[PDB]
Amino acid sequence: TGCSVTATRAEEWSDGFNVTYSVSGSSAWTVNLALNGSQTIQASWNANVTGSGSTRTVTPNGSGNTFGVTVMKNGSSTTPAATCAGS
Numbered sequence: 001t002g003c004s005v006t007a008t009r010a011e012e013w014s015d016g017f018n019v020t021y022s023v024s025g026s027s028a029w030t031v032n033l034a035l036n037g038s039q040t041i042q043a044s045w046n047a048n049v050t051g052s053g054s055t056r057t058v059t060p061n062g063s064g065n066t067f068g069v070t071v072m073k074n075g076s077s078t079t080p081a082a083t084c085a086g087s
Helices: none
Strands: 016-021 032-034 041-045 067-072 081-083
Touching: none
Parallel strands: none
Antiparallel strands: 016 067, 032 081, 041 067
């Protein structure tokens, strides 16, 4: 009974990959992004993403259920983890 966000690696290179999490189920949802290792958030869009350490809270703008952000592989080309909840 909550938002069902999903992940999907889109772009990628020897520095970071543009992950694309697709939200589906509701508009008022929250996808807590969690980079891996020392990864970091180089950029994002389709949603207000922000953080300060190893996790960033994602939020829908009103027409971008699916968001996308660059993942500073920094020695890690694995996709980050994302969770959601109905509020």
